[PDB]
Design a protein around this ligand. Sequence first.
Ligand SMILES: CN[C@@H]1[C@@H](O)[C@@H](O[C@@H]2[C@@H](O)[C@H](O[C@H]3O[C@H]([C@@H](C)O)[C@@H](O)[C@H](O)[C@H]3N)[C@@H](N)C[C@H]2N)OC[C@]1(C)O
Ligand SMILES: CN[C@@H]1[C@@H](O)[C@@H](O[C@@H]2[C@@H](O)[C@H](O[C@H]3O[C@H]([C@@H](C)O)[C@@H](O)[C@H](O)[C@H]3N)[C@@H](N)C[C@H]2N)OC[C@]1(C)O
Ligand SMILES: [Mg+2]
Ligand SMILES: [Mg+2]
Ligand SMILES: [Mg+2]
Ligand SMILES: [Mg+2]
Ligand SMILES: [Mg+2]
Ligand SMILES: [Mg+2]
Ligand SMILES: [Mg+2]
Ligand SMILES: [Mg+2]
Ligand SMILES: [Mg+2]
Ligand SMILES: [Mg+2]
Ligand SMILES: [Mg+2]
Ligand SMILES: [Mg+2]
Ligand SMILES: [Mg+2]
Ligand SMILES: [Mg+2]
Ligand SMILES: [Mg+2]
Ligand SMILES: [Mg+2]
Ligand SMILES: [Mg+2]
Ligand SMILES: [Mg+2]
Ligand SMILES: [Mg+2]
Ligand SMILES: [Mg+2]
Ligand SMILES: [Mg+2]
Ligand SMILES: [Mg+2]
Ligand SMILES: [Mg+2]
Ligand SMILES: [Mg+2]
Ligand SMILES: [Mg+2]
Ligand SMILES: [Mg+2]
Ligand SMILES: [Mg+2]
Ligand SMILES: [Mg+2]
Ligand SMILES: [Mg+2]
Ligand SMILES: [Mg+2]
Ligand SMILES: [Mg+2]
Ligand SMILES: [Mg+2]
Ligand SMILES: [Mg+2]
Ligand SMILES: [Mg+2]
Ligand SMILES: [Mg+2]
Ligand SMILES: [Mg+2]
Ligand SMILES: [Mg+2]
Ligand SMILES: [Mg+2]
Ligand SMILES: [Mg+2]
Ligand SMILES: [Mg+2]
Ligand SMILES: [Mg+2]
Ligand SMILES: [Mg+2]
Ligand SMILES: [Mg+2]
Ligand SMILES: [Mg+2]
Ligand SMILES: [Mg+2]
Ligand SMILES: [Mg+2]
Ligand SMILES: [Mg+2]
Ligand SMILES: [Mg+2]
Ligand SMILES: [Mg+2]
Ligand SMILES: [Mg+2]
Ligand SMILES: [Mg+2]
Ligand SMILES: [Mg+2]
Ligand SMILES: [Mg+2]
Ligand SMILES: [Mg+2]
Ligand SMILES: [Mg+2]
Ligand SMILES: [Mg+2]
Ligand SMILES: [Mg+2]
Ligand SMILES: [Mg+2]
Ligand SMILES: [Mg+2]
Ligand SMILES: [Mg+2]
Ligand SMILES: [Mg+2]
Ligand SMILES: [Mg+2]
Ligand SMILES: [Mg+2]
Ligand SMILES: [Mg+2]
Ligand SMILES: [Mg+2]
Ligand SMILES: [Mg+2]
Ligand SMILES: [Mg+2]
Ligand SMILES: [Mg+2]
Ligand SMILES: [Mg+2]
Ligand SMILES: [Mg+2]
Ligand SMILES: [Mg+2]
Ligand SMILES: [Mg+2]
Ligand SMILES: [Mg+2]
Ligand SMILES: [Mg+2]
Ligand SMILES: [Mg+2]
Ligand SMILES: [Mg+2]
Ligand SMILES: [Mg+2]
Ligand SMILES: [Mg+2]
Ligand SMILES: [Mg+2]
Ligand SMILES: [Mg+2]
Ligand SMILES: [Mg+2]
Ligand SMILES: [Mg+2]
Ligand SMILES: [Mg+2]
Ligand SMILES: [Mg+2]
Ligand SMILES: [Mg+2]
Ligand SMILES: [Mg+2]
Ligand SMILES: [Mg+2]
Ligand SMILES: [Mg+2]
Ligand SMILES: [Mg+2]
Ligand SMILES: [Mg+2]
Ligand SMILES: [Mg+2]
Ligand SMILES: [Mg+2]
Ligand SMILES: [Mg+2]
Lengths: 148, 51, 185, 159, 58, 49
Amino acid sequence: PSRFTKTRKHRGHVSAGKGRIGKHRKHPGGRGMAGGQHHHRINMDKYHPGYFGKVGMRYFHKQQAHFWKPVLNLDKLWTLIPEDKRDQYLKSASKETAPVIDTLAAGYGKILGKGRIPNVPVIVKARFVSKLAEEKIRAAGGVVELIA
Amino acid sequence: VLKKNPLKNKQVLLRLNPYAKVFAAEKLGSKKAEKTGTKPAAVFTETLKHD
Amino acid sequence: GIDHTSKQHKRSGHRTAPKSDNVYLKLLVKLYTFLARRTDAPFNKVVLKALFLSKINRPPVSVSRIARALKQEGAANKTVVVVGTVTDDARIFEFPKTTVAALRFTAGARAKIVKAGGECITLDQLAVRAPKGQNTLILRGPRNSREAVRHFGMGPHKGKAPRILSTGRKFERARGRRRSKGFKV
Amino acid sequence: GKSHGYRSRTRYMFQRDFRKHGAVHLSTYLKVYKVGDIVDIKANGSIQKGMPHKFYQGKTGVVYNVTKSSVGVIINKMVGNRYLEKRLNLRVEHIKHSKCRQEFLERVKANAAKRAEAKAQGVAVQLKRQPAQPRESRIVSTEGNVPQTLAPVPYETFI
Amino acid sequence: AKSKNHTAHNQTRKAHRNGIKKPKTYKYPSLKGVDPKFRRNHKHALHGTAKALAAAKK
Amino acid sequence: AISKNLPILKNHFRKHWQERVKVHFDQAGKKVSRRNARATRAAKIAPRP
RNA sequence: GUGGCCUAUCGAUCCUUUAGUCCCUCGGAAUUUGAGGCUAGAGGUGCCAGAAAAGUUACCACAGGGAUAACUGGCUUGUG
RNA sequence: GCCCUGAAAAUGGAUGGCGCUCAAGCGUGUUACCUAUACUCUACCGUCAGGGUUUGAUGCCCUGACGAGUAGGCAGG
RNA sequence: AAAUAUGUAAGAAGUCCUUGUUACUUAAUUGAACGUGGACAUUUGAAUGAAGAGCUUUUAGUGGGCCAUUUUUGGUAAGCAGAACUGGCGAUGCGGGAUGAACCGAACGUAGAGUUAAGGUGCCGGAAUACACGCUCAUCAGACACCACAAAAGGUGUUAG
RNA sequence: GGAAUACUGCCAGCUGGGACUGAGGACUGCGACGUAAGUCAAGGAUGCUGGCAUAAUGGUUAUAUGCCGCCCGUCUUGAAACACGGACCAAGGAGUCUAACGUCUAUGCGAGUGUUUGGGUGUAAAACCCAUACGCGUAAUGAAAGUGAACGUAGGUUGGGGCCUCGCAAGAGGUGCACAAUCGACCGAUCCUGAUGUCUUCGGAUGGAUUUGAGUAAGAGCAUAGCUGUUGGGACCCGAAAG
RNA sequence: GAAAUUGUUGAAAGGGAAGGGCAUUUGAUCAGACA
Ligand SMILES: CN[C@@H]1[C@@H](O)[C@@H](O[C@@H]2[C@@H](O)[C@H](O[C@H]3O[C@H]([C@@H](C)O)[C@@H](O)[C@H](O)[C@H]3N)[C@@H](N)C[C@H]2N)OC[C@]1(C)O
Ligand SMILES: CN[C@@H]1[C@@H](O)[C@@H](O[C@@H]2[C@@H](O)[C@H](O[C@H]3O[C@H]([C@@H](C)O)[C@@H](O)[C@H](O)[C@H]3N)[C@@H](N)C[C@H]2N)OC[C@]1(C)O
Ligand SMILES: [Mg+2]
Ligand SMILES: [Mg+2]
Ligand SMILES: [Mg+2]
Ligand SMILES: [Mg+2]
Ligand SMILES: [Mg+2]
Ligand SMILES: [Mg+2]
Ligand SMILES: [Mg+2]
Ligand SMILES: [Mg+2]
Ligand SMILES: [Mg+2]
Ligand SMILES: [Mg+2]
Ligand SMILES: [Mg+2]
Ligand SMILES: [Mg+2]
Ligand SMILES: [Mg+2]
Ligand SMILES: [Mg+2]
Ligand SMILES: [Mg+2]
Ligand SMILES: [Mg+2]
Ligand SMILES: [Mg+2]
Ligand SMILES: [Mg+2]
Ligand SMILES: [Mg+2]
Ligand SMILES: [Mg+2]
Ligand SMILES: [Mg+2]
Ligand SMILES: [Mg+2]
Ligand SMILES: [Mg+2]
Ligand SMILES: [Mg+2]
Ligand SMILES: [Mg+2]
Ligand SMILES: [Mg+2]
Ligand SMILES: [Mg+2]
Ligand SMILES: [Mg+2]
Ligand SMILES: [Mg+2]
Ligand SMILES: [Mg+2]
Ligand SMILES: [Mg+2]
Ligand SMILES: [Mg+2]
Ligand SMILES: [Mg+2]
Ligand SMILES: [Mg+2]
Ligand SMILES: [Mg+2]
Ligand SMILES: [Mg+2]
Ligand SMILES: [Mg+2]
Ligand SMILES: [Mg+2]
Ligand SMILES: [Mg+2]
Ligand SMILES: [Mg+2]
Ligand SMILES: [Mg+2]
Ligand SMILES: [Mg+2]
Ligand SMILES: [Mg+2]
Ligand SMILES: [Mg+2]
Ligand SMILES: [Mg+2]
Ligand SMILES: [Mg+2]
Ligand SMILES: [Mg+2]
Ligand SMILES: [Mg+2]
Ligand SMILES: [Mg+2]
Ligand SMILES: [Mg+2]
Ligand SMILES: [Mg+2]
Ligand SMILES: [Mg+2]
Ligand SMILES: [Mg+2]
Ligand SMILES: [Mg+2]
Ligand SMILES: [Mg+2]
Ligand SMILES: [Mg+2]
Ligand SMILES: [Mg+2]
Ligand SMILES: [Mg+2]
Ligand SMILES: [Mg+2]
Ligand SMILES: [Mg+2]
Ligand SMILES: [Mg+2]
Ligand SMILES: [Mg+2]
Ligand SMILES: [Mg+2]
Ligand SMILES: [Mg+2]
Ligand SMILES: [Mg+2]
Ligand SMILES: [Mg+2]
Ligand SMILES: [Mg+2]
Ligand SMILES: [Mg+2]
Ligand SMILES: [Mg+2]
Ligand SMILES: [Mg+2]
Ligand SMILES: [Mg+2]
Ligand SMILES: [Mg+2]
Ligand SMILES: [Mg+2]
Ligand SMILES: [Mg+2]
Ligand SMILES: [Mg+2]
Ligand SMILES: [Mg+2]
Ligand SMILES: [Mg+2]
Ligand SMILES: [Mg+2]
Ligand SMILES: [Mg+2]
Ligand SMILES: [Mg+2]
Ligand SMILES: [Mg+2]
Ligand SMILES: [Mg+2]
Ligand SMILES: [Mg+2]
Ligand SMILES: [Mg+2]
Ligand SMILES: [Mg+2]
Ligand SMILES: [Mg+2]
Ligand SMILES: [Mg+2]
Ligand SMILES: [Mg+2]
Ligand SMILES: [Mg+2]
Ligand SMILES: [Mg+2]
Ligand SMILES: [Mg+2]
Ligand SMILES: [Mg+2]
Ligand SMILES: [Mg+2]
């Protein structure tokens, strides 16, 4: 609100906190990004290393669909099972029955390896995995089924 | 709540330093000294009065 | 007049009370200010202060950090104290029992502490059971974990990350970021 | 146009010390510098490689690195309102062990002694250092020395 | 229009506000710049003695 | 017009952008009106769903 | 022994052009041309942190400046 | 050493003015005295701080120190 | 070869014994670097000071300065031009310099009493037309830092050498 | 030879005159005088008397008198200035709003979080409810194809608040979060190493490297709001010669 | 029915402006208090 604002406080001091010498004028720098390459280079270098020019390959008509590949670590992976059913599959580690986790269902495109999932085997249906993910799954007795 | 000075106001001069009682009672400000008669070497009064 | 050795009329620059208007919070202050003065117990004075800290200085203590804290030698049977809110961590499968005195609890942490047979205590209950704060454990959340302190001290060859909206190639990766264009940082 | 090149103004600083020019006596190359030693930095104009910059002449520092010909030294240089840590690569021609620490260690060794020597005697040590203390009372003798009286002298020209 | 050129006037006073803070010493200083060969051994030299205080409690 | 450490913004009001501003002050008014237009079909439409 | 005994002898982004692996992409799929990329140098900015640039206004104009010239005054006093 | 001479400028004029000549001048010595928003002591105001104290507890109470300010910042109003 | 200014040191992150690790290094289990373990105490290592110390973010104004003593460049000089250290003025009143941005004094909440500073005490004007030894008589006397100027050269004026 | 006195200093020696101040408001402290009971000038004024009880004190006001006081605003090293604006009065008269954002702080919830496009509903622009999606987090590094976070109690070491143990205490040991410093480890880029194997050129295991990243290493976010700050907009208000 | 500004009445002061600060006298005018 206006009533809290410093500009109320500046009522009665001439310059409005703007200064008596250097005043407050229209555009002492130039407008916007003007002179990144000249007077403003000291700010533009540091604070924005990398601004000017180009770097590698263009792409004509890119579409981020094809790139949809959400990532889920074995940090979690067990979050895809609701918690009643979950402790149920936790105890009784066995093949012949093991939980079926369809990750592409859960919104994901790849399984990463973050770490430490229980000794409990799981069948993880997935689109892609890391070599380290799919290893740890196999160190709990589980496997990986590629799906689409 | 008010600083009072010793050196006047006996009461507090006697609050600190009760040896105050003794000093005043025995004088000692005014203590005489032991008169001795020792005289300076005639070398001294030569070089004192010398040119 | 006076040659002045240090700045005059210097506010001590320590929060005297919370900036918060929460009544209950203020009461916890009222409690611990009493405890702090009379108890002579260190643990109290600390918690008084930490009751002042802003959101920034009350980082969420994750339930798993509490797990790890208790695995300390002889530290299993202490009661962990968090001035701040405590958070549910999916990433532990096992969890210990104990007792957690905390200003706030998120839904899961409470569910996760109780389900394992532990107890979610409000701080004044901790004052009742622990007046001098005996057999207590204090755990601070990570402060510099925050995403703002990413950008602090951004400079050439500080590798400090820039303030920027859209990221990728095309975005502050060219001049001065690579020896092939200008210099590198 | 104004000039500052690396060696500017160093004319008399790097100059070779009268009757002391020429190749460098071998004890210089003999001394062994272990990391953490306290070094004095003095350039030797005959040795152009591994040469300190003119700022660091007179400076004292400590050696963080030991390579073939050269001890890397850190110096705290003041710039602006702070000091930055600076790292110099110097050939040992330009370096010498600093004797600042000399009395220290000698006092350290001295202190441990006076400690076990007085303690194994039943303590009463007082091993800290004291500034010069005002003189004590003394008698002085006039025997064979009578005061010889003195007068200021009248003006004379003699040129 | 000709103007002043340079001076160090007052520039000292301004430093001694925030006062010329001292160099900031630390124990365990940085190995940045140390002889790379000396580090590549020093690595395997600590690695051993860590494994040797690990069999000391065993 | 460049200072401090601030992300470079891009905020594209260089045209007379105040000439095209739609506030939807009808957000309520339309939500009513297209309910009333739904009632008018469901009756005019006979039991059809 | 990592050019000239030391203290000087030099040059961004865009662009073109070469060197390098024979590596990455031209997005329906391939092969073969052609095109793009990364790493590294050159083509040059000398106003040397780096615009693409001729004059006249005795017909003139605006913003300003005593931050600055033409005169009185003030310091100076070589010169007179 | 003091004094004289060297010593010419324009409105009428300035040891600040009057005036002063064993000074009210010059050199030097000794006292006494006069009086700054400074120094000391006390009252009051504010600010900062360190304590005390569960019924204005955002409170009350004790104690000490400090107080110049354009551009400017923050604060309570 | 000074003076003034200048680098580092004055300890627990210290000193000493013992003997581990390695792909470095030595003829060499040599040495290097980091170490396990053990010993050494208080007066933890000169003075002085300290209410404190360390640390982080963010942002205003500003980015024409000027002056004084000393150092110092150009210039015949300049209230000129231009550097060095510091203190100032600017941004600051108060007492003194009659007056005056920068000199002296001293810096500022409202008051009281005391005492002072710099400067003064014939009268204007608060305060000795005080005391004391001298010098000085000007038909242009002289009279107080910064400061509002004077010189070479002369006097058988008088004074003391 | 014996004194005196000056001079300098000391006294917890005694005492006259004058000025200003009287903060505080039961008691509590340090003491002091007393054989004592008591008393006191001992942690801040009380006792005695008189006048008036009213414009007498005082407030306000005009004025006279002593001393002091130059026009404000502004730009400026410097302004009372022979610098500019201002004859007078009233009423207007200038850092806003919006989009996108930085730091801080409050709040709701939290590995997630954002009802308000829209739908349901209403006492009808309000309040109340909600399905899927989306946005932003939870993975990074590469120009890219693409690869993608535990040797170990998520590591070693130094300091760490708090807590634990011993001790009456002084002290000693234990554990040690945030944070700080350092030595390692893990992911991607870069350079090398190239096992088992096989379309004979695919495959890239294993071990490395003064190289590098806005990474990992028991999550800190997302959303509302406020101050201050940014940029674009008529962008604090008024002003061109032009086009 | 404000201000600038103006008439008349009342009061006051005024030797080349007026206005201000400290302080008191004097004129005028008033609150409070006490009982
Ligand atoms: C400060 N006021 C001054 C006033 O004092 C005077 O200025 C003098 C001027 O007279 C002096 O100058 C003059 O007078 C002096 C002598 C009197 O010192 C002579 O030496 C000099 O040759 C002459 N020009 C000059 N040296 C300093 C200024 N302040 O005249 C000018 C003025 C502005 O009125
Ligand atoms: C009420 N108006 C004023 C009034 O105040 C009074 O003015 C005096 C004035 O006369 C005094 O007197 C002074 O002023 C006058 C005036 C004519 O300039 C001078 O002639 C006189 O020399 C001077 N002493 C002056 N010292 C203070 C004012 N209060 O005199 C009448 C008036 C000027 O009209
Ligand atoms: Mg202005
Ligand atoms: Mg401002
Ligand atoms: Mg500006
Ligand atoms: Mg340019
Ligand atoms: Mg930078
Ligand atoms: Mg670009
Ligand atoms: Mg990617
Ligand atoms: Mg598919
Ligand atoms: Mg003061
Ligand atoms: Mg101040
Ligand atoms: Mg030169
Ligand atoms: Mg020499
Ligand atoms: Mg060379
Ligand atoms: Mg210019
Ligand atoms: Mg000039
Ligand atoms: Mg300049
Ligand atoms: Mg220049
Ligand atoms: Mg319609
Ligand atoms: Mg070689
Ligand atoms: Mg070379
Ligand atoms: Mg040669
Ligand atoms: Mg080039
Ligand atoms: Mg295509
Ligand atoms: Mg293709
Ligand atoms: Mg240029
Ligand atoms: Mg240039
Ligand atoms: Mg033209
Ligand atoms: Mg013509
Ligand atoms: Mg003509
Ligand atoms: Mg014509
Ligand atoms: Mg001029
Ligand atoms: Mg002239
Ligand atoms: Mg001349
Ligand atoms: Mg002249
Ligand atoms: Mg003369
Ligand atoms: Mg005269
Ligand atoms: Mg006089
Ligand atoms: Mg005299
Ligand atoms: Mg006298
Ligand atoms: Mg307080
Ligand atoms: Mg308090
Ligand atoms: Mg102030
Ligand atoms: Mg201001
Ligand atoms: Mg020490
Ligand atoms: Mg040890
Ligand atoms: Mg100027
Ligand atoms: Mg300017
Ligand atoms: Mg001048
Ligand atoms: Mg000048
Ligand atoms: Mg000058
Ligand atoms: Mg200015
Ligand atoms: Mg001022
Ligand atoms: Mg001043
Ligand atoms: Mg004055
Ligand atoms: Mg003055
Ligand atoms: Mg006073
Ligand atoms: Mg006084
Ligand atoms: Mg007069
Ligand atoms: Mg008088
Ligand atoms: Mg006389
Ligand atoms: Mg006399
Ligand atoms: Mg004068
Ligand atoms: Mg005497
Ligand atoms: Mg009283
Ligand atoms: Mg009586
Ligand atoms: Mg009466
Ligand atoms: Mg009266
Ligand atoms: Mg009056
Ligand atoms: Mg008046
Ligand atoms: Mg005056
Ligand atoms: Mg102006
Ligand atoms: Mg000017
Ligand atoms: Mg002015
Ligand atoms: Mg003028
Ligand atoms: Mg002007
Ligand atoms: Mg103008
Ligand atoms: Mg004017
Ligand atoms: Mg006007
Ligand atoms: Mg006008
Ligand atoms: Mg979501
Ligand atoms: Mg530790
Ligand atoms: Mg400690
Ligand atoms: Mg291959
Ligand atoms: Mg405008
Ligand atoms: Mg804006
Ligand atoms: Mg216009
Ligand atoms: Mg037009
Ligand atoms: Mg045009
Ligand atoms: Mg009127
Ligand atoms: Mg007249
Ligand atoms: Mg006047
Ligand atoms: Mg007239
Ligand atoms: Mg008056």
